[PDB]
Amino acid sequence: HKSDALFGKHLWNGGKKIVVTEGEIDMLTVMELQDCKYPVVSLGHGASAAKKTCAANYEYFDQFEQIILMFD
Amino acid sequence: MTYNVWNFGESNGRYSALTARGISKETCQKAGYWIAKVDGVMYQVADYRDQNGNIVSQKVRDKDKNFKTTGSHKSDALFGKHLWNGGKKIVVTEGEIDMLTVMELQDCKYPVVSLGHGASAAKKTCAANYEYFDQFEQIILMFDMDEAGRKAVEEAAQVLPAGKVRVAVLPCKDANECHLNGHDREIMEQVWNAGPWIPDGVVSALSLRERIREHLSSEESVGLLFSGCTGINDKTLGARGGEVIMVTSGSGMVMSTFVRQQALQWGTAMGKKVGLAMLEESVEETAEDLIGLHNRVRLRQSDSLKREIIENGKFDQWFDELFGNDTFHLYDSFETDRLLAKLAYMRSGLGCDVIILDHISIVVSASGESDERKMIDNLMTKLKGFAKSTGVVLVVICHLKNPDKGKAHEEGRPVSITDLRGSGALRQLSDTIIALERNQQGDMPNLVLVRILKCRFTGDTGIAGYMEYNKETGWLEPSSYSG
């Protein structure tokens, strides 16, 4: 479980907008409500490792136009 | 083991016309798009076969927009592939349905295959097939007309053979959206004779019509008029968005007022939201200086009046008056990259249209590096980038190095672009250069001159008018003056 883990990450390479949720279940949620058509990933160690997991992924996230942090 | 390939007949198969898509029955029949129905529900089955003819895999659909993939869908799957072994030209579409489309419009006489995992696996599916595709003279990539769809094309052509690739350009999302009442003839004009490219920054003029039109209406000739000296305006035609205005001069606080004044009238007379990064002074401080300036009184510079308006309610009144239109916002301090970022969110987040950055001379934080000569330039660019990239108006204040030649700055001495600080970046990257001179020991110690030192948009430059300091109100008033 590397310091840059994002659950759902492999689904999206680019886009106009990517929601990023705290945990896996919440990702599953946004992935519904949207009929799984847009991007959602969840924090790999979520909660506390928000800073590390994120900066580990600058490039990946910059692939999208706006990053919507939907945390607790 | 892996999901068995779906037997035709076993599953109640029919080669029926897709009435929903304008694909004929005869069409589905040739590419191998058949309609089964197993255990009750009716599925759409796409038959992927290798060049040898044998069915290697299936991609099955149900109504609601689900899937089910039979056989072994290898990393090189091309739907339609088995139909063409050679040719003068082969269209390559994103999905099965779009393949069925080109296969129509052409009476199924020429070659079309669709990507096996299409969308995202454009690079892999394609390079897997170098040999197969090289069997044709030119490869016409007819992918989706969106974000990821142009990307697909790019990654595709990269791995595809030599000077054969040409990009398809349709009026709508995909080749089928076109067919589904619209422009069959638009698809056609592409199959024959499409354009060339895997250029991520090269942009043929033709392909700019729309971007241009919308520009012409959006952005504005007489952009934001300098205040306090028609002249500045006459010669520069204002501060057009995405420009980078650079105010400079000698000891000029004159300079820091001038900018301040502008901030003022842009954020009040005009509707525009100003953003201020006054790196010299505090955020409280500059706010005061605005309020006082807006009320034509030297506010900070007076113990008595401060007290007076705090008590007589005039402060909360003036403050509301000036500020309460959420129009001014200030960067408040205590890096380069770090600054630039803040400035950006002013633009992007709070969406101000002017950012005034008072005093470039202050670089600040990332210390192990030589000449401010060099670095001044590095910043300069990021700024011009920020500017043009985002269309914000960026006024940038900047202070002058000091002659070594005879007459000083307060001796009026005029300034040239050579006279310029930096080591070229500003002397370059800036669109308009306004300088202000002030011979503070002379005939009019309060008279200040305004050179336009440069102005891309017009190139009309030179002396552009005079102003006079009212030591009393604090304003750079406009003045009568010439020869």
Sheet holding A6-7, edge to edge: A6-7, A40-43, A15-21, A64-70
Q: Which CATH class is domain B230-483?
A: alpha beta
Q: What amino acid occupies position B82? A: H
Chain B hits for A16, CB-CB cut-off 8 Å, are: 147
Q: Reduce the DSSP state of residue A30 to 3 states and report it.
A: helix
Residue B120 and residue A13: Cβ atoms within 8 Å?
Answer: yes
Beta carbons of B30 and B80 less than 8 angstroms apart: no
Q: Distance (Å) from the C-alpha of residue A2 to the closest C-alpha of chain B?
A: 24
Three-class secondary structure assignment of chain B: CCCCCCCECCECCECCCECCCCECHHHHHHHCEEECCECCECCEEEEEECCCCCEEEEEEEECCCEEEEEECCCCCCEECHHHCCCEEEEEEECCHHHHHHHHHHCCCCCCEEEECCCCCCHHHHHHCCHHHHHCEEEEEEECCCCHHHHHHHHHHHHHCCHHHEEECCCCCCCHHHHHCCCCHHHHHHHHCCCCCCCCCCCCCHHHHHHHHHHHHHHCCCCCCCCCCCCCHHHHHCCCCCCCEEEEEECCCCHHHHHHHHHHHHHCCCCCCCEEEEECCCCHHHHHHHHHHHHCCCCCCCCHHHHHHHHHCCHHHHHHHHHHCCCCEEEECCCCCHHHHHHHHHHHHCCCCCEEEEECCCCCCCCCCCCCHHHHHHHHHHHHHHHHHHHCCEEEEEEECCCCCCCCCCCCCCCCCCCCCCCCCHHHHHCCEEEEEECCCCCCCCCEEEEEEEEECCCCCCEEEEEEEECCCCCCEEEECCCC
As a whole number of angstroms, the distance between CA B42 and CA B35 comes to 7
Spatial separation of the C-alpha atoms in residues B464 and A63, rounded to whole Å: 47
Are B399 and B359 a contacting pair, CB within 8 Å?
A: yes
Question: Is B33 in contact with B43 (CB distance < 8 Å)?
Answer: no
Beta bridge partners of B90: B139
Q: B287: which strand partners?
A: none
Is residue A24 part of an annotated ligand binding site?
no
- Interface contact B147-A13, CB threshold 8 A: no
R_g (Cα) of chain A, nearest Å? 11
Query: Residues B134, B161: contact at Cβ < 8 Å?
Result: yes
Residue with tokens 């985002």: B390
Residues of A in contact with B120 (CB under 8 A): 13
For an interface test with B, the pick among A13, A67, A68 (most B C-beta atoms closer than 10 Å) comes out as A13
Phi, psi of B426 (to 5 degrees): -75, -50
Q: Cβ contact (<8 Å) for B120 and A16? A: no
Six token digits for residue B103: 């296969």
Type of residue found at B63: K
Q: Is A22 annotated as a binding residue?
A: yes
> What whole-number distance in Å separates Cα of residue B400 and Cα of residue B402?
6
Q: Would you call B16 exposed, middle or buried from its count of C-beta atoms within 10 A (0-12, 13-18, 19+)?
A: middle
Q: Where in chain B is the domain with CATH 3.40.50.300?
A: 230-483
Resolution (A): 3.5
Residue B134: HSE in the Cβ half-sphere, 13 Å Cα cutoff: 9
Residue B393 identity: V
Distance of CA B225 to the CA centre of its chain: 25
Nearest Cα of chain A lies from the Cα of B261 at a distance, in angstroms, of: 35
Cα B441–B446–B452 angle (5° rounding)?
Answer: 100
Instruction: Write phi, then psi, for B83 (nearest 5 degrees).
Output: -75, -35
Is residue B291 left, alpha or beta, with left meaning phi > 0 and alpha meaning psi from -120 to 50? alpha
Task: Tell me the C-alpha distance between B250 and B410, whole Å.
Answer: 7
Looking up tokens 């992935």, which residue turns up? A31
Tokens matching residue B401 = 């190095």
**Residue written as token pair 């009184």:** B297
Answer for the pair B77, B63: CB distance below 8 angstroms, yes or no: no
Q: B69 and B91 in contact (C-beta within 8 Å)?
A: no
Single-letter amino acid code for the residue at A16:
K
Element at A29 (helix H, strand E): helix A24-33
Q: Are B261 and B293 in contact (CB under 8 A)?
A: yes
